Symmetry: C4
């Protein structure tokens, strides 16, 4: 029903990496990826882009050469998601603030003007046969 529809995806991506991660790293890096609960703190810390490479990534990377793939793919993807959620909430915001509020009038101040043109139509009809019942009564 709107944005929380990626907000689910984000939660899903997240939990996918916490498992992907505890499942490689818990072995040599308990403090970070030991428990599942472990893998999430560490991952939301990565999410905050606070000491992601220097603090967490680089120490794991020298242990597991390929471990960038994980950290980076994760940040790329996980941010590309939040980029949306954000934009989504921008749109979702101004769609309220303005657009809906204004469209309601562009329609209804154009209902008002549609009827205005109708009432002249009728008036010009009625007249128009009076004018040719001066041509039948003359």
């Amino acid at each position: 029903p709107g944005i929380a529809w990626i907000a689910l995806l984000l939660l899903v991506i997240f939990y996918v990496f916490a498992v992907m991660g505890t499942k490689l790293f818990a072995q040599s890096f308990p403090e970070w990826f030991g428990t599942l609960g472990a893998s999430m703190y560490t991952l939301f810390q990565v999410m905050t882009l606070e000491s992601w490479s220097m603090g967490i990534a680089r120490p794991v990377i020298e242990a597991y050469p390929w471990a960038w793939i994980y950290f980076v793919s994760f940040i790329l993807v996980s941010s590309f998601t939040v980029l949306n959620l954000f934009i989504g909430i921008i749109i979702e915001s101004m769609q309220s603030a303005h657009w809906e509020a204004e469209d309601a009038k562009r329609i209804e101040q154009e209902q008002r003007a549609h009827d205005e043109r109708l009432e002249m139509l009728q008036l010009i009809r009625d007249l128009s046969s009076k004018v040719d019942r001066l041509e039948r009564r003359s």
Copy 2:
């Protein structure tokens, strides 16, 4: 009076978490939370996402193993709430640029054409009256 109302909710959160923070951690971390004034600067650093977990929160969590809920809830709450400030501003920014200005130039653009039709609407009724009299005066 608008978004300025919400930056009161964000000054209350800092306070809720600072008293909460001094009253909790001061004893073992006089560094950060040992007074109020410091437990805010620590909260302002934790808000800027500067070292919040390596420098502050992962040390704290060593001594009280539950304090993550303190920091994860603070980053969330104190972030979501300055998403509102970066939004409501972003909007009442657009609002001045455009909406107020053009929105009013359509109120009037219709106003002016409304009167145009309400003037046409006139003559027409004027003409009817004239044909009507012409009608009666030869029956």
Copy 3:
């Protein structure tokens, strides 16, 4: 010329403060604030929020327990500003692809509507004034 009126202001504050902190701090921390051009860098990394407190301000604050006003002012101030190039480029951007081309496409559909409405106006007059003429001879 608009946008860079804030960019010129930001350039200012960067300098206002840069002198500020070379004057106050350059003796106790020559590494960070030694020269002026040394604060120009250091305030650039404070601005991007990289180890600003824990590695710079907290260390200076130990020297001058009131320097936090120097740091917490700059953060707030240079933030609020940095925001408005973003909000400034946003606005001027939307402006390009949409806003400008809309007021034109609309003013001009209203000219036509106006003139169509004008023709009708004169047309009724002449018809009002044939019947004016006809009624006086009747």
Copy 4:
């Protein structure tokens, strides 16, 4: 063709600084700029502002005291390039959310309108005939 047009820019801005970095620091900073990949990563770490100054630039600046150029420039180049891809993505967002329909739904309203306002050019000319034959039938 849009934003992946800017996506290549950011990719070719990286590529450049990457080779430039390795051909600059690879002698003294093996772990950071020891190879091309090495630098690509390190720059993503700098690009995400994660620990860039106390960790990379400052300790590098130590050996080449001009290096700030490289780091402070790459920051500004790449972060602006992301502000574009961002914006062109906020706008192409708005477009399909709102501006799409609201511009089509108004052309179709000024169709309705013009037609109505023409419908009565008709009546008003017809009536101007009947009344033109009341003036000659006299």
